[PDB]
C-alpha cells in the first residue's frame, strides 16, 4: 500500500508516534518519505547482505527475521514480511524500540541526512489529525 502524506501522518499519530521520545510527527513522516516513499511494500538490500523492509525501511541485521541474514538479530521478534503489511502496526512498534535504543532517529540514515534540522513540520502541513 502507498499512503498519502496526511494519511500516513494520521496512522502514525493514531499509533502513538507523534512526539515519541520527543520526535514530532513530521520527523516520522519525513523519514517514511525518504525511506520508502510512503510504500509499505518497499524492500532494499544493504551492502552488508541485510535487507530493509517497509514504510520505515527496518533492517534485518538487527530488527526482524527474513531467514537470509547471517549473524543477525531479531530484536523486534517479527518476520521482516510483517513489515510490508498495509497495516503499519508492526513497523510502528518496531520503530519505537529502534528509536529507544540510544541513537534515536539517527538509526535512520535518511532521517539524519534529509530530515534532521529541517522544517519537518511541513510534512504534516494541512493534515486533519
Ligand atoms: Cl495502518
Ligand atoms: Cl502500534
Ligand atoms: Pt493503522
Ligand atoms: Pt498502535
Amino acid at each position: 500500500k502507498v499512503f498519502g502524506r496526511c494519511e500516513l501522518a494520521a496512522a502514525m499519530k493514531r499509533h502513538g508516534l507523534d512526539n515519541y521520545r520527543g520526535y514530532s510527527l513530521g520527523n516520522w513522516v519525513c523519514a517514511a518519505k525518504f525511506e520508502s516513499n510512503f510504500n509499505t511494500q518497499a524492500t532494499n538490500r544493504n551492502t552488508d547482505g541485510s535487507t530493509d523492509y517497509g514504510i520505515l525501511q527496518i533492517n534485518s541485521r538487527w530488527w526482524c527475521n527474513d531467514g537470509r541474514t547471517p549473524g543477525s538479530r531479531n530484536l523486534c521478534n517479527i518476520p521482516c514480511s510483517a513489515l510490508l503489511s498495509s497495516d503499519i502496526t508492526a513497523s510502528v512498534n518496531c520503530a519505537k524500540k529502534i528509536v529507544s535504543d540510544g541513537n534515536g532517529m539517527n538509526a535512520w540514515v535518511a532521517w539524519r541526512n534529509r530530515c534532521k534540522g529541517t522544517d519537518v513540520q511541513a510534512w504534516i502541513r494541512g493534515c486533519r489529525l
Side-chain angles (χ1 to χ4, degrees), residues 8-52:
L8 186 53
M12 291 182 152
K13 180 157 145 64
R14 169 108 191 93
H15 290 276
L17 278 183
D18 192 11
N19 270 275
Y20 194 84
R21 300 305 180 251
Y23 290 93
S24 79
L25 185 61
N27 286 287
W28 297 104
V29 175
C30 182
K33 173 74 192 156
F34 295 126
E35 289 295 357
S36 66
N37 198 24
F38 304 154
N39 182 7
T40 61
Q41 300 195 70
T43 57
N44 291 282
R45 198 61 167 277
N46 296 315
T47 60
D48 79 350
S50 64
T51 301
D52 305 322

Side-chain angles (χ1 to χ4, degrees), residues 49-68:
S50 64
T51 301
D52 305 322
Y53 294 87
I55 201 91
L56 286 164
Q57 290 288 274
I58 288 180
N59 137 99
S60 64
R61 197 309 191 200
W62 296 108
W63 301 113
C64 58
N65 176 63
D66 67 4
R68 72 169 196 189

Side-chain angles (χ1 to χ4, degrees), residues 93-105:
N93 290 337
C94 188
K96 286 173 165 164
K97 204 161 190 304
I98 296 167
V99 77
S100 305
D101 83 14
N103 279 358
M105 281 199 75

